[PDB]
Design a protein around this nucleic acid. Structure first.
Ligand SMILES: Nc1ncnc2c1ncn2[C@@H]1O[C@H](COP(=O)(O)OP(=O)(O)OP(=O)(O)O)[C@@H](O)[C@H]1O
Lengths: 246, 246, 246, 246, 246, 246, 246, 246
DNA sequence: AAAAAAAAAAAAAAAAAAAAAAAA
DNA sequence: TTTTTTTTTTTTTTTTTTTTTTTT
């Protein structure tokens, strides 16, 4: 019956916000790398919404070059009239970002190459801001493993605080259930089981939203039956590569 | 005598449409991969024609790169003046697709590489639309099987609902026959046999259209004789790799 | 004395033309694969000459990639200003070929790989034209034999009608002899014997042209003697790999 | 005393020129494969010099790929600004060689692989010219011997006339002696003996040139003594793999 | 006391140089293969130093492929900007080497395979230069012995003059002693005995240089004692595979 | 109490250094092969440390191919940006090593095959450096024994000085004891007895270090008791293949 | 009732740990070979878990080659992006393992061939770590017995400490019983008798776990009856090769 | 009249299932070997069908090597894109089977060699699954009899539970008859007599199916007459050896 | 012990034609 | 006009190796 909670401050969200606060305070690059669906992107979005002078961009493979990444950062800054060349855009970003003590949150930073990462590191160094590189466990692995540990030496030195989010914690699903008004022990155990699945918090949110929608359509309250039905839906455990083969 | 039916709503078509509706509502990526000639592309085309704010593109090996796939998507959107660079085109697609709650159906998505699939994934994430990847069993097999379950981890994580179409069901051919005005039990059995041949509805439609054309030319009604003649035609059981040796 | 016939409509030519007409009407891929020198390439050329909206290309190993094959198809279309990229060229071909109900005859289609064949079948599907793959037994043997029957599954399902030309039939050589004004039973027997040689119809044409040229030079009518002299020429039965050894 | 004859029209040269004329007239591939030092390369060079619209290239192992062989052919054609890709170069060759009824002489053609030979065959077919292939017995042995006769089936069918040069005939050495002003019966017998050695005509030419140079230096006429001295030179009968052992 | 002679024109050097001049004049391939330490490499180096338009390369097992061998030849030619592909490099070598009547000296030619030797032979044929191949008995043994006499048939036919250097002759050591200011009969006998050892002239030069260095250090003239001490050094007659066992 | 000596100059070390100086001066290949644990590798390492323009590499079975051995040599040279192909890397090594009169110490050279040994031999010949092969008796045994004395003929001829180290000499262990401050006659006899054990100097060093560590832990001086305890340790006389059986 | 102990520090475990510590300190190869089921692999695993900079790999017959064994070691090191060639992987291992003074425990080292054992020995030499070879009596028997004591001479010389585990000792089973809370003298005697059976500690662990499971299911305490039932199970005394015959 | 039962849960099937459960629980290898046709393979297949995370492969002499056996195991796992090398395939199997608590049943394991059995044992050890060897008495006889019991010592120690199936038991045929709706005492005696014949359950099933087919053809019920006729059929007592010679 | 066959397959160039948008 | 870039790619192979097995 109640409207779904758009965002809840879980333990993982609190840790990620602490990492971003440290990055903005010490003015050094921070790495927030975790497995998919652990609450990273929504934590970054909520941090951007609730904190002034915080700018967040995502790195698509189309915006994975220096000019396109700088243009994305400028568009996030509101500089809709930014120059379309590398040098003028870099200088405009240096002028606009300086003196703000901001926090440029590079979501999906694993797509960044060496040149773009060097450009971002130089921008942070000459701007004195926080640069939170996000993504998956490839963010750290890109800066280590042979020739990459000497080319990325300066960038790896800039990294002050690094956070690894392996799996969604029990406190996270507990907070989500509390925000969803769920009290049943069986329901909590089912939510915890859904959490350990790949795409942890995404699958948890999909199951919760589908169960809430089904209960609202049927005019009843959400219980373990609706959660189980939603989790059995989505065909998560379907080996569809073998279904077509056989 | 009556005109052939352009499209008939079948069980497989209904399941695919349910998957599309779920993808558009939940705003998460869905996978619809089936064996050749099971009714995926035609159902997707009918969904696009009957529903507003629904966009369909096909992924040829020529349009299997980020720039070309984004250009195809823009051309589907009606943005005939789309930018020719990766970044500006991605931003234009983000502005155009946002706020529509649409459904971008990526037909033949098995041709997409890691880069293009990742870019489309990020576009869906930052746009809040539904992405329906189609093709064959290789769509799922690309995202699983070793090193590709950690590179495609995030893309696998967004996948909300996946639908398997191994072979066309009896209800599908029953609906096709009813739309074709076929009542004979022998004709129904012949259609059922025709469906299980490789390329189920491709061969079924070819045989039905040929039988109808032959009957109309001869001025008679369609019966089992014309169906059998059409099925014996098309040389499906011709091992044309051995008619030359022997 | 009479001028040689540049082309004669025969049984093999009639069957190949029936296959091409079926491919153009049903708008589905057709395969015309036979042994060398049976009357396939000339049949396709004559079909292109006598039928409008019919475009024929040959696939050299240099034009066996997607970009080069699409450029060859565009040049056949008269699009001498075709784009030099894969995507723009594919879209230009989609625009130009659409609405014509044409017939793209891919001569020597055995050279095409999986990528180019997949691109061509997708172009045919999105354009609603007839695609005729031509060549030798490898045209079909490429789409069967293990992993190639599941990668080429959709393309194999596209194949509506497949025609095998193992050896030149008796009616074919009879029609050619009639076009060459040959009545002698011994001459017909010699022509039939010449046909069964490898490179059947090429050897037939070479022998006929040589005999006609020699008879015209000598001022006499063509008879079995000139045919025998021409056939004993061309050194068909010369084991030239053992003449050097011995 | 008289200057050596650069080229003399021997019987083998006449046969090779007849094969070349037949290939250029019939517009079909011809094979001229013989033992080393029989006069094939010099006959081809003289044919190219004395006949217009005749182009000759040689196939080194570096120029044994499609792009490099096509570039060699273009450079022979005088197209010094030829494109550096397979497709554009093939199309440029098709445009330039078409309408000339020329004769593309492929010297050392046994080095061509299946791909390059197939491309050259298709170029000849779509250009209507004469392709002449030479080398050693491996030219024919490449297109025969099991799987090689079904892969090279079309190319073997193209072959109109094939000429074998096992060893230089008595007429060849007779013509060479006549051009060299040699009348002695012992000298003719010695030249015939020199011919039967491996590398027949190369050894013959080397011996004749050495004898002529020695006679000119000594101010005398060439006789059997100088021929014998030259033939005992060149160390043909030196088992140098055993001279080091013993 | 006097400085050692860098190079002395021995009888073996004279014979090798005669072979080089014959190869450069006749413009045909020559082979100079002999046992280790006989003076072939130094003779080639001195010929390159004292004669213009003479190019010498050595064939390491890394430079035993067509591309690397052609790059070595180009670097010897001074073409420091040679193309890195097979075809363009071959054409550049053809253009640069043509019209010079040079002498491409292939040291250690026994490492060349069939492909590289074939390419070098065709380069010499189409360039009209002299190709000199050195090494050991395996240079000729590679072109004879079964299937190797028919694959290497043309290359064997090209060979104009082949020179065998089994062991250094008495004239060689006599000239070396004369250049070294050695007159004692015992010293001459000791040098002759040193020559017959494996690595004839390598050991001879090493012993002479060591004796001269020791005499210069002691301030005396070189005599039989110093040569004997040097020859007893170098541990030539040490069965070092048995000193460890016993 | 005193720190262990890192390295001590002994008779075997002096002989090996004399061989290395001879190889670097004469610019010819030298062989230093001996039984395991005789002081070869440490002598080579100390020579590299104390002498400029001296480069040492070891040949692991993975680095026993031409490309990998050349890459090892380049990495020893400091060429961290060396090319990854055989030819360019060989030319880079030729350029870098030339004009230095250096000494390439090939430790564990018995793992090199014919190809890699030939490449290193030609590199030394074209560079005028000292190639000091090292290892065990197989270094020489690979170059003799039938067909191996004619394939390795040039390499064997180039071997200037070969040094055999069967067992560590009495002077070697005497110098080691002097560096270890050992005066007891019983201790000297025990060290000599330890020397004759297999892995002579490895075992001697292990025993000395263990005795010194035990004495330092107990606060006493090293005597015969500690050496005997260390030698009874290390379980050299344990027939561990019969302990498990019994 | 109490949970089973995952690991107990037996006397054999203490001896194996002493050997591993000696190998890591002395930086020399150690051998831990014994009869199966004595407590070797679990001791190595526990040592790896409790000590930092300790890497343990196992040698399957598929991982018995140099490349696969080095890849196994790299994967144990944590570099999932290790190069797949012999040389680059060896250099990456040398770089990563250097400066750590680690302990690479090669479990099941009896499967290693001469090449792989030599490569691991050289890696340990150039890295200064402790290589602990494990397995059965064949580990030593591979390095002794004729030709194998001279090829494996260096590897045998580098073996610092070798430890024999013939059978599980009384102290080991006493410690296991103490960790299992077993006090009965009859139970202790039964455990001792179980130990002397082949596969000593595997059988002991299986019997103890089955007895504990049966007691927990029946709600009683483990005594002599449950251990006797478990030992009579597992069908150790079943001559199953004679049951089928009779 | 009733359809034949596909499977019946017999006493032998129950014992085999108990052995498989024990193997999957104790995480140790189990051996299920018996006489041919005693209900082993079908019991294993039924257990695989009715249990999750259970994988069954058969070992034929074609797939009796390490690479092919691992490929078959991977194909059973559904990894149709498994690597083709020994090491990568072994690592992929280790990653896929780890944590699944699986049970790999190796049907007809007597064909496995020492290398493949060792690889499977190490895979089970490092994966913690249940390896069920299967076949005939050779499975155990390969692990005992001299040198085979010291080479297979570890594998023999790994074997937890071994089950012998000498012949089909009375309860087995009783359950089969009950599932086949047979009540006659004479029919039961005939089935029992059929069971003791070689190929016990294969022969019993063949006789029962033939009798049922004959009864259905004649429209009567199965009784002793039909079973006797079926048993006299199949030529079980026909000695082919003596009829042909005589 | 010796010769031949059938793969996987992974790292490394390099090089050349085509727009193609934008600022002064 | 003048320039600045820029980026996107598409093909070019090229090699180096790395077993895997299979038989005689
Ligand atoms: N429970 C059962 N009910 C009916 N038939 C059975 C049953 N178990 C086995 N069979 C029959 O046994 C035959 C083959 O299975 P079975 O286990 O006897 O083979 P096997 O000789 O052990 O096999 P292999 O030696 O190849 O592993 C079939 O005819 C099958 O019908």
């Amino acid at each position: 019956l109640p409207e779904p909670p758009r965002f809840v401050e879980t333990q993982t969200v609190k840790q990620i916000w602490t990492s971003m606060r440290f990055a903005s305070l010490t003015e050094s690059i921070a790495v927030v790398c975790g497995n998919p669906g652990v609450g990273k992107t929504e934590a970054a979005r909520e941090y951007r919404r609730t904190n002034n002078n915080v700018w967040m961009i995502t790195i698509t493979p189309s915006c994975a070059s220096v000019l396109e990444c700088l243009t994305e950062l400028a568009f996030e800054l509101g500089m809709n009239d930014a120059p379309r060349r590398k040098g003028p855009l870099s200088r405009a970003l240096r002028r606009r970002l300086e003196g703000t003590q901001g926090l440029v949150i590079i979501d999906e930073a694993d797509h960044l190459g060496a040149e773009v990462l060097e450009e971002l590191r130089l921008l942070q160094e000459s701007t004195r801001i926080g640069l939170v590189l996000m993504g998956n466990h490839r963010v750290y692995s890109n800066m280590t493993g042979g020739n990459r540990t000497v080319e990325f030496a300066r960038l790896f030195s800039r990294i002050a605080k690094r956070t690894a989010i392996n799996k969604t914690k029990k406190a996270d699903v507990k907070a989500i259930a509390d925000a969803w008004q769920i009290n049943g022990e069986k329901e909590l155990e089912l939510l915890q089981q859904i959490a350990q699945k790949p795409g942890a918090l995404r699958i948890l949110n999909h199951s919760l939203r589908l169960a809430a929608m089904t209960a609202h359509g049927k005019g009843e309250r959400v219980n373990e039956d609706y959660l189980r039905q939603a989790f059995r839906e989505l065909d998560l455990d379907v080996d569809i590569s073998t279904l077509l083969r056989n």
